Write a protein that binds this ligand. Structure first.
Ligand code: CPS
Ligand code: CPS
Ligand code: CPS
Ligand code: CPS
Ligand code: CPS
Ligand code: 5AD
Ligand code: MET
Ligand code: SF4
Ligand code: FES
Ligand code: CYN
Ligand code: FE2
Ligand code: H2S
Ligand code: H2S
Length: 347
């Protein structure tokens, strides 16, 4: 199909595998810009001009897993490990609420020390502040996810990473795509707003894999989708692999918006890392959420999922005002409420 025919089918919501594979395989600049324009317009029509701010506190870099791409993998001995205390986490969350954050995201390595009861206590304290709480702690038993929901957690971010089960198992040797999906379905059944999403440009990943990632996200109708390029980390087995391509990752964001028009889609930190200004571009091609770093020094510099992570050298209250300025220079508006998904039911 020509690029014009693909766009026509995308505008008519004819989301066949062939259409998605062709959209990802055409590299014509005119096609790409029309695709970005379509996703930008779909975003504006369904989710409006508000860009929702989710303040992230990366509260521990301890991890029991050994994912091949991740700088926090347990075999990396070239890393100072840290754990914030529950009081530090709660008071850091309070400072973010004082700065205007309406969602607090708690993210960590899979660190058993807090699980499940310390997390529940922290969540209860933060919920007293009248904000949304999102957890991103990895794979844990249903009993833990249930305790955290009863403590008040609203959302859970568990990126599916890759929908190809063979690749998933080789990159995440402790677990499987089957377990990852089971976790996501459990999270949805418990009432969380649930976030999935993948990396783009993983070693061995093909365009057919990316199409499957899109169809996976569409199949389960996730409330949030977090997408970013793979960035190789020197202290991992993938150190010598190529980084993911920014334009291809941006096309995945755009297609995700076109497929899931009312979903919440961040312009991820990784997008800001591989290309200067990458998050701002992504907010104009389908994304509607930004997640400023609210981890305090001296820990912020130690949460090294991939190298070059932006925000590391800024003062540690800098990132919320920075994204507020970003939203204004983009001609967008701050989110007024918690920014939960607002479903538009269609046909
Ligand atoms: C129109 C003006 C000035 C042309 C001139 O010098 N008169 C030129 C100067 C620099 C150009 C941008 C950069 O190239 C980066 C990027 C490359 C892509 O390929 C096309 C898009 C983009 C944003 C370009 C857009 C545009 O084309 C610019 C602003
Ligand atoms: C800012 C630059 C270059 C200026 C430009 O191409 N803008 C057209 C008007 C030209 N001007 C009126 C400024 C000069 C005319 C008088 S003059 O005689 O001086 O030429 C333009 C050129 C291509 C544009 C992107 C693409 O679309 C894809 C995508 C569409 C989304 O929806 C919004 C995001 C995104 C990334 C766009 C952003 C931005 O928009 C770009 C970079
Ligand atoms: C934390 C300290 C001390 C006072 C305090 O503890 N203040 C709690 C405010 C709680 N809220 C944010 C919920 C109020 C929102 C009311 S509002 O009318 O905005 O809806 C206060 C004093 C001055 C406040 C900044 C400035 O003002 C400029 C700017 C306004 C933006 O907008 C939000 C970001 C920013 C940087 C502000 C952040 C923060 O707040 C500051 C630092
Ligand atoms: C200038 C930098 C590379 C800097 C560098 O590292 N040198 C390159 C890397 C990725 C490029 C953008 C993407 O392709 C998406 C999009 C395609 C449109 O067609 C034109 C606009 C836009 C935003 C591109 C502009 C520009 O071209 C970028 C930012
Ligand atoms: C002190 C910091 C830096 C400056 C730079 C950009 C400013 C924000 C933007 O202007 C958009 C918006 C305008 C509203 O009027 C008031 C609220 C808000 C969020 C501003 C608050 C504050 O003033 C900011 C964060
Ligand atoms: C928290 C999210 O960080 C992403 N993540 C982890 N390691 C990398 C990397 N090297 N490059 C890009 N993204 C990564 C995963 O998608 C993970 O779920
Ligand atoms: C720090 S990676 C994100 C949180 C969790 N460890 C996961 O892999 O899903
Ligand atoms: S991706 Fe998450 S689970 Fe895997 S090593 Fe990194 S922190 Fe641990
Ligand atoms: S959030 Fe923008 S540079 Fe830190
Ligand atoms: C992540 N943003
Ligand atoms: Fe993220
Ligand atoms: S930042
Ligand atoms: S920013």
């Amino acid at each position: 199909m020509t690029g014009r025919e693909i766009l026509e089918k995308l505008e008519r919501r004819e989301f066949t595998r062939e259409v998605l594979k062709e959209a990802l395989s055409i590299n014509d600049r005119g096609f790409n810009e029309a695709l970005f324009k379509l996703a930008d317009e779909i975003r504006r029509k369904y989710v409006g001009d508000e860009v929702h701010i989710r303040a992230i506190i990366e509260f521990s870099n301890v991890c029991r897993k050994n994912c091949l791409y991740c700088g926090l993998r347990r075999d990396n001995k070239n890393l100072k490990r840290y754990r914030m205390t529950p009081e530090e986490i709660v008071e850091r969350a309070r400072l973010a609420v004082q700065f205007g954050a309406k969602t607090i995201v708690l993210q960590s390595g899979e660190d058993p020390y807090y699980m499940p009861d310390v997390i529940s206590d922290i969540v209860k304290e933060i919920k007293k502040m009248g904000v949304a709480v999102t957890l991103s702690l990895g794979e844990w038993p249903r009993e833990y996810y249930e305790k955290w929901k009863e403590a008040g957690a609203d959302r859970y971010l568990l990126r599916h990473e890759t929908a190809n089960p063979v690749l998933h198992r080789k990159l995440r040797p402790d677990t499987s795509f089957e377990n990852r999906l089971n976790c996501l379905l459990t999270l949805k059944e418990l009432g969380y707003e649930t976030g999935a999403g993948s990396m783009v440009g993983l070693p061995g990943q093909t365009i057919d894999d990316l199409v499957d990632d899109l169809l996976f996200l569409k199949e389960h109708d996730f409330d949030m989708v977090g997408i970013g390029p793979f960035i190789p980390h020197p202290d991992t087995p993938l150190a010598n692999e190529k980084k993911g391509d920014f334009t291809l990752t941006l096309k995945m964001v755009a297609l995700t918006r076109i497929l899931l028009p009312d979903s919440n889609i961040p312009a991820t930190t990784a997008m800001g890392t591989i290309v200067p200004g990458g998050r701002e571009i992504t907010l104009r091609c389908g994304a509607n959420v930004i997640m400023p770093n609210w981890t305090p020094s001296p820990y912020r510099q130690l949460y090294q999922l991939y190298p070059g992570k932006i925000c590391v050298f800024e003062k540690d209250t800098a990132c919320i005002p920075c994204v507020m300025k970003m939203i204004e220079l983009l001609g967008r508006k701050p989110g007024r409420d918690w920014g939960g998904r607002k479903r538009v039911f269609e046909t």
